Symmetry: C2
Subunit: 222 residues, 2 copies
């Protein structure tokens, strides 16, 4: 199969690929969730949700493994690392709860509303739902063992944030010799608009390929 | 010690920290080297070389370990991976040498000028010179082993490019629980201006801290 992409088309087998949906939780796409409370812009994720819905529908009907990532931790944040971890000092959710104790133990807390997958996106039997404790899905998880168990060597990325969890996971997969593609209209960045453009440029130029949902489904149609 | 930085200052012990000089080879910083040949603007790297030497002097005087990265491979590029590796398809050196066969074996190749550390930056006994096969210094190398073996938990980054090998290595350091700092004026991006700004933003916002050489040296003086 050929997927049209920048900087050039690639060939791949959908039965030996995975559609990875990164962090499509209320924290990352819903007004009132973590990213919004922490000052990031979330007002435009409605098309992103729908675009992933279309892509998931196309990927499952082609025999592609769907992996859903849920980022976050136990509600006491033992899994976020204590003061000894950079993630304690960097996490903008932790920072946000330190400034607003009313939200303590709610942001990115397993079991909470912030943690839930957004209503529109409902995994189905045979999908994999993966929790992860840091930005990249390859560190501290069985993701790599899962893909190699199935001979998967091509990865298609969707989700949020383009420049944070999507890019780091794609970057790390490249280092583990995976071929990674991002569908640009099924992502949203965390930061200013230039953060979207910059993460796409890094991927296309150095680490993977950039395509789009419409092209993706059209490539899967046969 | 305290180091002033964005988004806030951090504390660290120089004797339990490393300064990392990423890829300060002719390929990345010299006219007529790899990046230049591939169409990246390399005309403004001269101040980067001067600011790194300033940083190296201060760091060694403080007991901080110096690590030099040299990116590249055997002249046959066996180590860059064959066509089954995404590095074969994404390496812009490999791409450039496939468009200008006269350069085959010349870019990023062990024993070649392109691969040599620039004339201005001379590793001293006591430093570690580390070869790496891929963008991130933390894959396929003993870098992590080396830092752990010394109780090293803080990393100060300099080098080229800010968005590629520098940021990749800092990001993976973060997933390995390293506190990573980048000195913004001792780095230079591969790509347009947003590539520098975005790399600084992503580090400062999600992965680490941003300072500069003047600050860094002042912090080490006592």
């Amino acid at each position: 199969t050929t997927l049209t992409a920048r900087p050039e088309a690639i060939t791949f087998d959908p039965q030996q690929s995975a559609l990875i949906v990164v962090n499509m939780q209320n924290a990352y796409a819903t007004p009132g969730g973590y990213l919004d409370l922490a000052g990031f812009d979330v007002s435009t994720t409605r098309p992103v949700i729908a675009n992933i819905q279309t892509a998931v529908t196309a990927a499952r009907a082609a025999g592609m493994l769907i992996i859903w990532f849920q980022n976050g931790w136990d509600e006491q944040y033992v899994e976020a690392g204590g003061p000894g971890s950079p993630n304690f000092h960097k996490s903008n959710a932790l920072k946000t709860m330190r400034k607003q104790p009313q939200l303590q133990g709610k942001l990115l807390a397993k079991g909470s509303w912030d943690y839930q997958l957004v209503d529109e996106l409902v995994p189905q039997p045979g999908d994999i739902v993966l929790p992860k404790p840091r930005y990249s899905g390859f560190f501290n998880t069985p993701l790599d063992s899962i893909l190699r168990s199935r001979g998967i060597r091509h990865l298609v990325f969707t989700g949020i944030a383009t420049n944070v969890c999507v890019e780091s996971t794609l970057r790390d997969g490249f280092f583990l010799e995976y071929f990674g593609v991002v569908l640009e209209d099924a992502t949203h960045q965390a930061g200013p608009k230039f953060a979207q453009k910059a993460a796409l440029f890094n991927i296309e130029t150095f680490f993977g390929w950039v395509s789009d949902v419409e092209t993706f489904c059209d490539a899967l149609s046969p």
